[PDB]
Design a protein around this ligand. Sequence first.
Ligand SMILES: N[C@@H](CCCC(=O)O)C(=O)O
Lengths: 509, 508
Amino acid sequence: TLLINQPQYAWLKELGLREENEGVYNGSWGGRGEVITTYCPANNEPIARVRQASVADYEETVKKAREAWKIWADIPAPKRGEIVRQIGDALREKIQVLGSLVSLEMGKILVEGVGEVQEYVDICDYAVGLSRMIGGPILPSERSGHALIEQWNPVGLVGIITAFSFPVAVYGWNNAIAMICGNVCLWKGAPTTSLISVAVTKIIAKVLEDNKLPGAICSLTCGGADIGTAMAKDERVNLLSFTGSTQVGKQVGLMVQERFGRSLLELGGNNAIIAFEDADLSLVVPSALFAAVGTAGQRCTTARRLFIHESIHDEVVNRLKKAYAQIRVGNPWDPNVLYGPLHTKQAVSMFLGAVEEAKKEGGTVVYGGKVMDRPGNYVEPTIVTGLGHDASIAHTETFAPILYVFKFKNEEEVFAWNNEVKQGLSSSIFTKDLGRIFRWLGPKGSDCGIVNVNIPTSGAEIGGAFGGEKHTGGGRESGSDAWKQYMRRSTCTINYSKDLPLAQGIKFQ
Amino acid sequence: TLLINQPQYAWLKELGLREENEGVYNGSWGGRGEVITTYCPANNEPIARVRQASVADYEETVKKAREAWKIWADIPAPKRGEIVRQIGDALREKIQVLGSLVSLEMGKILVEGVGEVQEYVDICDYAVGLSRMIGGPILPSERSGHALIEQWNPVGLVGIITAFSFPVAVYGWNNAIAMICGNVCLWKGAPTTSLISVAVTKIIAKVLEDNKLPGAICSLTCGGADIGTAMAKDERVNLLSFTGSTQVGKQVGLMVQERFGRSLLELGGNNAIIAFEDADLSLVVPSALFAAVGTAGQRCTTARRLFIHESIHDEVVNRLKKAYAQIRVGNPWDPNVLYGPLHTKQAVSMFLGAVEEAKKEGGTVVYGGKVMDRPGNYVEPTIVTGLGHDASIAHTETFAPILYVFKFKNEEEVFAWNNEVKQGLSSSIFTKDLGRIFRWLGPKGSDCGIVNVNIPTSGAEIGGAFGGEKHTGGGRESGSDAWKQYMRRSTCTINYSKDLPLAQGIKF
Ligand SMILES: N[C@@H](CCCC(=O)O)C(=O)O
């Protein structure tokens, strides 16, 4: 009855998965907490089991991680980079089966699950180079015979809490950067993607163990909100990177602030696409379709608001409706499938409530709006017109494929409407107007962390910093100098002279 | 008689080498030039043969590379980085056989041959990350409604001329960086390491082929000075990276300057180690030995001058002599061996000439000084005392294991004596004094491009920029922002408004 016992899913064993798997790793494998069975969202079948972390498991793992840090922080960064290079290699070796497991346990289509593993492989390669670059400037001191240098050192233990929607890549972004920065990591993933968490940890553990490194450098404590809360409260967790709901993220931030820890918060998005009258509609329509229905609308960066200039609103909505009707629904691992299930039955519940609420607030469902009558957690990708831009439901993040469509007339008002929500993750305008594009990018433009032109709100690349503003939580991951969040800056003044001149020319004698 | 036809050298075939090899690669393999045989400097046996480039080969190769550039410069930098990543992997998979070829044809010991291939693997890994990073700042314009962007673009065709002593890694540094910067490469290596050049190019070519890219992205034209001079004079070679002797590099520099090209010169070194009275002698002696005799004294970063404080001069000399006597000499592929042959008989002759000139200028050979009596190009690593720091022979760079030892008393003079030569590549002090170390690193310290403390003059790592000042030519390779030498900067102002406000507030 478990999928992992059926011959058609024996590829799962290529990841080292079994009927029941240890969900704690700290150099040894265990798990004395509750046993969780995870399910395939496309057919509601159970896949396999994971023994989760008890509180005693959490405690011992934190200690072993902090013991491992003493060794790992002593290893020169480029040598830590080499470890991350081997992790990249080990992921490349398993990218198809790992991508398939993402499609199976999480529910996104296979090209997206493989693509998610590729994001991790890519950030690994990026971090290898970074391991020879991280640091700060040597600055010219105003004092004769003094050196002034900005040093960067690891913060220590980086707790990483991740959500279901990207059960591989988010951890990967955090882990590759944290590792080359000399931190140890402790991962608590979404309970409903526990096999993914275990399978990834199995890959990393083999690299660490083959290199005779303490496995706790990349520790795993599978569990629920109780483990996550313990991490938020744990003085030994020097940085807590939390990707998840804004509501939970706000509590995580408060807990970490209460103990003067560091948090990196990657929270909700309410991402708008804006199509101006001069837009290339052959870009707008497919970009909106992918941004809205990709991952069944379950990305932090999913397009949730579509603003269309009055002149082209009806045409775009009609073209969008014709495109939605061609979406190929099915099992996310099957060929030519573009659209799979939502991740849980609760997600279907939230989808239905949001559709209901949209109607109660005056919206019209012009496409979709229903649960699909078929095995699994399938819903129709949904388009809603007629709501005011400030309708409560439109300002709410519903992690589901509902696209709220609005009319607008002029640039100033629609930029303001993009910015009026509490979320601040991604945003996109479709236009040919040069000045408009640079205004969008400027101080009176989009207030989001990702500000795009003529592309969807989703699908960032790893070379830039990824994250948002306002209720999205302010953290950044991946590229640019995001690595600085995983390290502590020191400003270091070295007097190598025989005199003591004081800053600002102060004479104290 | 060819070693590649003998059974114990069949491993050469794992690099795709055969009895006669094509020395031109531009996407297809060819070579209408003179056939050169290369020889093993440990025993003077012929290894295999390479058909070098004719000038018609050179001409067709340049044209193919520049057409390949139009494809390659359109490929996003991160995707170019992916190609270089795969070159790293293919080198990694051949590191043993390639290192062995370096030991066979060039003559350095096996651990340095492997280590040199590792340097190329390392710069590949570094360039992959750089390929997602290269670029310039977006700057705040003083003008409303204007953007100000610093852009970087490939220069086009990068010619790479390399020397015998690092016949893999030098090309590797230039190749990895030039590629992610969007350039195509044309390589002319040392004729006496032609097999190494072909073997590296075979590895790269397979990667380009497997990725459906034109092979001319990494072109090879094996040949001698006539080819190198053609590259220096060729307006189609946008950047010429030249690693070699100061004497040739100066003419390369002038030829490139005459046509308003770009040159990256990596030239000779006359590198000093300075041991102060407070130095840890247990660090000094091993460091000086490896720095002087590593690669049989044939690195541009080799220690050629050793300054020792009067108080410890005699002790350090005596300890260096006893350590030299323990140097293990033999064939460079035998695993126990620390010291192999010089690369050529001409290197033996230049060494002999330098030793006798040191004697004629008043120096004393306290260790070595003689050629050895075994097959190959072996000479004794040599220590000369008693010369003045400005002895004519001590200011010359002889590419051979001769270490000139001098006394000093004061920090100011020995810093000056470090700086007094024409070269300016590497330098090193051994001391525990905190103030002395930062003075060494400061404006009144070493004038060199590499300024080390308590490590020898050789053996840098890829994270930093590599190169020298003064007659070493000023080029930098590998790390930091050396990549900018392979790209052209543009300062770009975009007026996206309906107004034309003038810089500096000029009302015209
Ligand atoms: N320049 C001062 C700044 C102190 C600031 C403070 O006391 O709040 C210092 O470095 O001591």
